[PDB]
Structure 1
């Protein structure tokens, strides 16, 4: 919003914070506190991959989440199968992590060969896309679950990553706006 040295470091720390938060959200299985079989019905702390026992006979026993149940699953339309495929593979949260890493590499690459102003625009586009991918991942995860509960800290770690990704994306595009302003200012003079 002002100066140049602060904006670069602020974008760098924001990108790193978003990347670490989204990696933690994907990596840690605290996404939904709900009752379910952890191996009787018992409160469990779930994630994207493996739902794990909590306050039960054998706490700390972790089991992978059943995404395609067997034993007469009754089937459904191809849309529901696609939804389970996206939920199980988590292509959108993983794509968000990948886009955050690519934006971080682009921001880091701005120090070398600073005359290529399109790298900043590339970083901004990548951060905005990472935010959109996080949005799609959250919507898909909630829709898949909807088929008492409360969300863990990793879900809100991911939700906070989307906010920071868009906030950094705004600054990244803003930095590109000023860099082209610098070109216009010197060209006239």
Structure 2
């Protein structure tokens, strides 16, 4: 069952990374009314909003992450939330952590001696899931700050979080099993 666990971990890591990357890249996050000219049903993502149907179908406009006038900075929580949403620091951090976890998977499959690489990969996957949760919460909060729906990119991110958590659990199990086998061999040789 050791090989099956390893294959499942590798496949899940790749799938979660691909889903998160597609969600970050694509712009089918939200289905809502808006204007793509720099009130029609549109689809928007983390960077661009594009109209569907109507007369401007296929036209995409970069999301104005700094709306409203009079430019008052009395409150810092709103500015911090707006900047965090605009940079999309947490979805990108989740993608980076998933990539680092996959790299740890590859290195462990190559090194085969340093058991800490499996643990590092598990930590990376769990942290990627946590960053995905933070990014989702930030995105929804920024959207709140009127009918709407969530597109397939949002659910791609959600599934990426779920798969990242599962792969982290599998990696921790693999690290535990490696250390248990090492301890059993050491005790037997003693």
1:69-90 per-residue CA deviation (whole Å, 9 max, x = no partner) reads 2643555511101101010100
Relative to structure 1, is the Cα distance of residues 46 and 146 closer, same or farther in structure 2, using a 3 angstrom cutoff? same
**In structure 2, distance between residues paired with 1:9 and 1:161:** 18
With over 3 angstroms needed to count, the CA separation of the structure-2 counterparts of 1:43 and 1:184, relative to structure 1, is same
Task: Please tell me the root mean square deviation across aligned C-alpha atoms, in Å.
Answer: 1.4
Unaligned runs of 5+ in 1: none
Figure out how many residues of one structure are paired with residues of the other and give that number. 187
Is the partner of 2:110 in helix, strand or coil? coil
Q: Write out the 4+ residue segments of structure 1 that deviate beyond 4 Å after TM superposition.
A: 73-76
Tell me if the contact between 2:81 and 2:138 (Cα under 8 Å) persists in the aligned partners.
yes
Summarize deviations over 1:129-156 as a string: whole Å, max 9, x none.
0000000000000000002000000000
Report the TM-score, using the length of structure 2 for normalisation.
0.95
Alignment match, 1:85: 83
Local SS of the residue matching 1:63: strand
Q: Deviations over 1:86-108 (max 9, x none)?
A: 10100000000000000000000
Q: Work out the CA distance in 2 between the residues paired with 1:76 and 1:49.
A: 27
